[PDB]
């Protein structure tokens, strides 16, 4: 039960999108539940890259398409690695993935 808030928020939020997306989910509830996904989607529309996944499909970039999707849900792991970093800072250590060789 140490990191059960984060793992069950991911579960409950995706299960509510999946149950309702493309049927009746409002856009206000998506932007409530996932505000930084909407924030990063709006960056592509603002900065004229609203077809960026069509661009990566035109140039066959199937591994930069998987990086594009993974970097836009990249903030789902931020409540964990801000928690594990504040464990290791108060325990004197350094967080592992913050370091180059570590």
């Amino acid at each position: 039960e140490e990191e059960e808030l984060w793992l069950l928020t991911l579960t409950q939020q995706f299960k509510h999108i999946q149950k309702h997306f493309g049927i009746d989910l409002p856009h206000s509830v998506v932007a409530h539940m996932d505000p930084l996904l909407i924030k990063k989607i709006d960056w592509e529309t603002t900065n004229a890259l609203e077809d960026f996944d069509i661009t990566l499909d035109d140039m066959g970039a199937e591994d930069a398409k998987e990086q594009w999707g993974a970097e836009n849900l990249s903030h789902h792991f931020l409540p964990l690695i801000r928690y594990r970093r504040d464990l290791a800072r108060k325990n004197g250590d350094r967080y592992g993935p913050d370091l180059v060789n570590g």
């Binding site: 856009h27 998506v30 909407i38 592509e44 609203e50 998987e66 999707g69 849900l73 792991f77």
Partner: protein, 62 residues
């Protein structure tokens, strides 16, 4: 019949006002809404293999 209008510039400017409103309405109102729900689905379908493998490596529950 009716071939030339009373003003050609008034009809050409009606076409430029209508097609620039459709450009504004698409860019501002429609296409943000299109891409908010196209790219929720597309980011989840592109990340799904690397999201779940990153989450498998993270949760200590196994």
């Amino acid at each position: 019949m009716k071939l030339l209008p009373e003003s050609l510039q008034q009809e050409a400017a009606t076409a430029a006002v209508v097609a620039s409103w459709v450009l504004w309405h698409l860019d501002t109102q429609l296409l943000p809404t299109i891409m908010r729900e196209h790219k929720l689905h597309a980011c989840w379908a592109a990340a799904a293999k690397r999201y779940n493998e990153k989450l498998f490596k993270l949760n200590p529950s196994y």
